From Swiss-Prot:
Gene Ontology molecular-function annotations: sodium channel regulator activity; toxin activity
The species this protein was found in: Conus consors (Singed cone)
UniProt-annotated location(s): Secreted
Free-text note regarding domains: The cysteine framework is IV (CC-C-C-C-C).
Name of the molecule in the record: Conotoxin CcTx
General remark: Found in both injectable (milked) (IV) and dissected venom (DV).
Residues the record lists as 4-hydroxyproline modifications: 2, 17, 22
Lineage start: Eukaryota, Metazoa, Spiralia, Lophotrochozoa, Mollusca
Length: 30
């Protein structure tokens, strides 16, 4: 089943593609 993946968008730390999060909130690296 073909999934429509997002574009060059970031996920919120690996969550849904509609949610975005910076690295500082994901791996605390900032
Ligand atoms: C963005 O791209 C998503 C899939 O992208 C992958 O493939 C493309 C090209 O094959 C890669 O590069 C993308 O395209 C190039 C040139 O066209 C550049 O613009 C890059 O910046 C761009 O990222 C891309 O990197 C690949 N991704 C990965 C992870 O490898 C989708 O096609 C996305 O489309 C949206 O998807 C969501 C759910 O995933 C919904 O289905 C949206 O409805 C859908 O787009 C909607 O329609 C669009 C055109 O009709 C547009 O109006 C959009 O705003 C709507 O939300 C796609 N999104 C956009 C904005 O292009």
């Amino acid at each position: 089943a073909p999934w429509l993946v997002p574009s060059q968008i970031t996920t919120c730390c690996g969550y849904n593609p509609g949610t975005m999060c910076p690295s500082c909130m994901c791996t605390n690296t900032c």
